[PDB]
Design a protein around this nucleic acid. Sequence first.
RNA 1: AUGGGAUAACAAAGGAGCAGCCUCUAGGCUACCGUUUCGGCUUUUGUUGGUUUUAAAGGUCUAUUGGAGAUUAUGGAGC
RNA 2: UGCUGUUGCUGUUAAAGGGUUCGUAGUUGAACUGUGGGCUGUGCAGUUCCUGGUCCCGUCCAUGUCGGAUUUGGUGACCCAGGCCCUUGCAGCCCGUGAACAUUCAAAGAAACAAGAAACACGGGAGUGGUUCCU
Lengths: 129, 200, 82, 141, 94, 83
Amino acid sequence: TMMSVLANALRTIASAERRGKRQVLIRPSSKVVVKFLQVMQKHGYIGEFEIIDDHRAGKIVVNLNGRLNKCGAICPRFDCATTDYEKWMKNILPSRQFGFVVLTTSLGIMDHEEARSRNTGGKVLGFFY
Amino acid sequence: MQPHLRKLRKLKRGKPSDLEESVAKALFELEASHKTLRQELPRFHVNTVREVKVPRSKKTVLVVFYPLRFLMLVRKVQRALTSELEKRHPGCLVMLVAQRQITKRPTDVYKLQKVQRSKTSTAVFENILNDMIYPSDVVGRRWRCRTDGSKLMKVFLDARDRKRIESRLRAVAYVYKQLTHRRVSFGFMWNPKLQQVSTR
Amino acid sequence: DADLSYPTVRTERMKHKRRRLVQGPNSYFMDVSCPRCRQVTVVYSHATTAVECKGCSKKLCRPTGGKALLVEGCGYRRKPDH
Amino acid sequence: VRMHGNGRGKASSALPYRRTPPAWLKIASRNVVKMVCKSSRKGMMPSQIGMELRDSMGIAQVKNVTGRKILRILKHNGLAPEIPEDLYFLVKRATQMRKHLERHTTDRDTKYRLILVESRIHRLARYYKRVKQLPPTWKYE
Amino acid sequence: VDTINAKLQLVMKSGKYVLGTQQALTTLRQGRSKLIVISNNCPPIRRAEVEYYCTLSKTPIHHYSGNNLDLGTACGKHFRTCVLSVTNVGDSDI
Amino acid sequence: IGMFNEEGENVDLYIPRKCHATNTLIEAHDHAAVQISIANVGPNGVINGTTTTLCIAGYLRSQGESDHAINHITIDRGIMRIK
RNA sequence: AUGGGAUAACAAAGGAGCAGCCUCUAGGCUACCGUUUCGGCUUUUGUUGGUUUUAAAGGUCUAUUGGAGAUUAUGGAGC
RNA sequence: UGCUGUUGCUGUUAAAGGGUUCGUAGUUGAACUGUGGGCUGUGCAGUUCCUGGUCCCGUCCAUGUCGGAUUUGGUGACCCAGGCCCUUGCAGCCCGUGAACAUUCAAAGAAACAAGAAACACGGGAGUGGUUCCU
């Protein structure tokens, strides 16, 4: 019973970053798991993927460069109006400098900083410091 | 009209092209009994177009479009036609690509549920590999996603088949781009089962 | 030393078929030739049924649980995958 | 995990990535489609039909040769069973256990294994009505 | 055993049968009967003449394994039959 | 390599070393925290001018992947030969 | 009220429980609606009331003009 | 007072998992239809041509088996390199695309056509539009 396929995905990345692994192999890839990872990769927290075809649901193989402290998923996916970036910045991120909160917006999966500038709000997905 | 002009699509029977004629003839000669077993599937068959594509290296490619109605014909014969269409035309590679419509993404939840999956892009563009590559198989796919943001497909043929198709792939890689406007890179792998990219 | 995305021969020869990176089958078709008549029938590796020659009905294999036993020196020829 | 009872065991057929039929199959689609139906007129189910093909006749997957699964082939020919076969083999177990327990009324183990089996039937019969594949008045008895 | 119980289903959706001992004697008298199935509790002098027409007409009796009520549900009908005769088989092989 | 003031003044107290395996900062209080200085060699086999030094964090030695990790590094550095 | 369409929800489906090929012209026949009984009716002919014809329209039958086709009819099947 | 806990509690032993299993209301629920391209100028990363600083070949020795040197060595190997718009990817900018594929080419995709489109095309009203609007 895989309820959220990000929950399973970003834990593995999280809990295999805490062990210093060079690579992680993630069980059910999905359109959201990729778009989330490609945001991690934009800011330098992950090296590379392989998305392997099983013909059913892929298997992502991520190269870790050692720079992730944590990866969450926020499970119920609460909303954000663009005025609510300050709650999430405040509660879930360590400092007001270096964290990132990842959202789904009309425009897509993007950072809370890519969202403030485009003015969309959306639903929260997770974070990474 | 002329006996070999019934190997084209009817619009192009009136005013064919210097390209479209020369396969028409060649398809006809082979329609006419010459090749055993293609005496079997000559007569019901047609061509829509053909296009000349020049890869940036060496030999041109004539991309012969025929209507999807004929796949199950050609898949039997496809190894024979291309071989014996190339003898007829020296110095250019002959590829056989059925023609397919692609419905745009609907955007309505209620329309997405009505779309023929075989008319969707991902399904179409795949069959435009299997057409360029046939009889050989796609053993694996991988999408390599690189820090740049680049995502690149890798399609793994059998190694048993290395000897025939190696020479064609730089073209097949390129033609595919011109048809799809997507990109492909090939590698081979031997036990396809245990997945080991051949290097040797 | 190892890549996860390109594993060694020795690691993945060991794994379960579902635990492979691929999910492959463990089975294959053999080309079997009946001893009693010279005739040739394809036979599935794990038969799970009584399999008979066509001309003579000989029961060319036993159903036995894991992997079917061919009968009495009948010639097997293993078919390719493709 | 498992629907009723606790096993976690995992054993399944793992279908191959490569879906084109082998080169050594010389059997036309229409010759497969007719085997299916020919052997379904012998009063067989699909879950067995597919065996006699991979066992003896060497057809691994009928979708991969014939364009289509063993039931569209039956549903198109009007040979498709009246009750889905996952539902037929449960009713068939439940009834034998009902016949078992009719002499043996102190056998508590199979009185509990019914309670499971029947509760399945009512879940499938809830699926196959919702999905419209059973008549909405279908009932156990 | 119940190996027959599978064949009566196929005859049921295929072939022609008639139920009941008095309507199954007419299939013997006409020599149209390809099988005769008889229950356990079929009364003896009824069993006896049914078996006797089957020796004259060379038709292959099968003595069933259960009641007329169970014979009857095998051919899934809600009533009871002590005698069943198969006019023609199906793809069920006798 | 530290947080700079708006006026450009480097504000850090010191900049810690990072494990060359795990890329974790080595903390003042971490007393495994090894440096391993391999003497760099030149033809004829004499030592000259050798800067290549490895840093391993306290974590990793105590599980015994220090050795496995120093194989990986000396191979990326070319100090070793795979064969 | 109005943009956006990533994530989601509602509804429908359950796949033989189906399913429209388009097009040039020619001919033939043919009211059109409505029903409980006499009912309704499209412009033009100067106008209104009454009658009637011709004509398109649609339909339907036959005729072949050009082209399609997401599944080979010069094909499968049986003699 | 995070001692009512959505943010945010606790439940082996401190208070607290029903004795087990089935199960309705209820809550939760797997993957998929989807990297648009090309041209210009400019920032990044991964085969022409030039190096001789390597290993391989070879030579001389022969050294029973842990010397070596040898020149040209050797299109071999290799390398550090170049304002090669020949490379590919990628950042940013301009800008074109009926823009996958097919299909049209008439005065500039017009018309047909493909795609889309009910915010639409298909016929119609002078009691429509400040006296029936525009060219």
